[PDB]
Subunit: 201 residues, 3 copies
């Protein structure tokens, strides 16, 4: 169907005639007309919120995949991890033997949390500074879509395909954020991993 312009899909379905704010016109990906708290009435605040949403969504997709993969590997493939549960995997650094990637001592075999934290601080600070402005992989032509070195396979060369892929990215990312919130609440309530919860249901 349509995901742009005035004939797009809306968040309340057939009951969304009086639910769409005026400043939401279908210009940007993911516009379902859902701003009922008026948090994006300011155009600059709207742009900041769009960037925040896309960054949160990409992090959430990565987090869903990385929270599911080791638990599923332990359950089925037989790979042994110190703590394969996503909300317990941070405590392996304090257990004796450290964090062994895929359970193999010959791999990373990290033993100090301080070195991990400092390396992450330096590397992530540099990477985020590059994302905001400049960087050796190209400059920040777009805050969200700098597809020169970050689009090396050329999926975004066609503008219509680019718009469709933007819609797909925002939808998958919103689903991943919803799934991550579900993971957080399930971990808080039941104390079981998502794979184990799925198996027991």
């Amino acid at each position: 169907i349509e995901f742009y312009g005035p004939d797009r899909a809306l968040w309340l379905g057939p009951y969304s005639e009086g639910a769409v704010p005026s400043y939401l016109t279908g210009e940007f990906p993911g516009d379902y007309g859902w701003d009922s708290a008026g948090l994006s009435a300011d155009p600059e605040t709207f742009a900041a919120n769009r960037e925040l949403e896309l960054i949160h969504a990409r992090w959430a997709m990565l987090g869903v995949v990385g929270c599911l993969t080791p638990e599923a590997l332990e359950k089925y493939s037989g790979v042994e991890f110190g703590e394969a549960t996503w909300f317990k995997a941070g405590s392996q650094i304090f257990a004796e033997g450290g964090i062994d990637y895929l359970g193999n001592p010959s791999l990373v075999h990290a033993q100090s949390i301080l070195a991990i934290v400092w390396s992450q601080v330096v590397l992530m600070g540099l990477a985020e500074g590059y994302r905001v402005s400049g960087g050796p992989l190209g400059e920040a032509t777009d805050p969200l879509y700098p597809g020169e070195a970050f689009d090396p396979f050329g999926f975004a060369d066609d503008p219509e395909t680019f718009s469709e892929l933007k819609i797909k990215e925002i939808k998958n990312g919103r689903l991943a954020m919803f799934a991550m919130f579900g993971f957080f609440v399930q971990a808080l309530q039941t104390g079981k991993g998502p794979v184990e919860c799925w198996a027991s249901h």
Copy 2:
């Protein structure tokens, strides 16, 4: 006294000369000049906040009445409920015998939480969709005051009486929201119902 225009009541009393933002001019009900975080400086955000406040206030009035009525009935009138305390009344669905209205098995006698949740989802979704736009009880001429089928006794026919009733509604609703927050904090801290807390004090 006066609750509209430039000579209205203000939230700091005689010390509110420098406390009223410029965009608050006494045009809408409940305007005491209290916006110190600047959350309603944008007119569209102000309208959204007004709608949110009125909806929260009506829900809070209903919640105060519904949280007080069963406990008071159990304490004095002698009516027997499974769990008459407001923050324990949700767990009656898991107790054997289910939820009996007024404690009578011949009444609702619900035992499945899933059916209750699904019926509530369908009915409340339809009702909220009607409230936002359209609906078989008239269309949404006003987001907050669609008084054609929802004002059948004609209390809002006189504009001056309508303004006074709007002021009364917003004030009672703010008081009910304050009372509901008090209920939440008292339940969290002491673990006793509002009626029992009142009796013991």
Copy 3:
């Protein structure tokens, strides 16, 4: 260095070219170009946020000093307090003997929490009303800098020195807010006072 105008210090250092919003131009103290959520895009909301930040910062500086002083006095100077830890000092009013200033019964020797609360309500309400508008120590020339009776030593007479002192005040206040957040998190996690935590590390 420079803390005003377009050649000022910025929050991302050499990577802050694309990190500074347009509405942040170096006109106000503490402008490092850090508004990534777009919460201050509206100028009136920006002014409200500036007032909130400065008030929070002054309260945080006072809180750091007042949370460190009694614990350090007990540890080193030998002064005896009922509860010298900052997050336990509120419970001395319920212990027998009350709250003795510097541990001396001849001092305040308060016994009732209700009188303390009522006196604080009256005095702080009057003082905050004076701060917002009017007051017997001068009227509110500036929401944040009413330096007539509140600047009696005349440190703010020179405009350039006034700007430098504003920068120093906002920086020390932000550091104190960061320290107070650290105090809160350390108290929540370890249950030990900042002085004791410093000694054991």
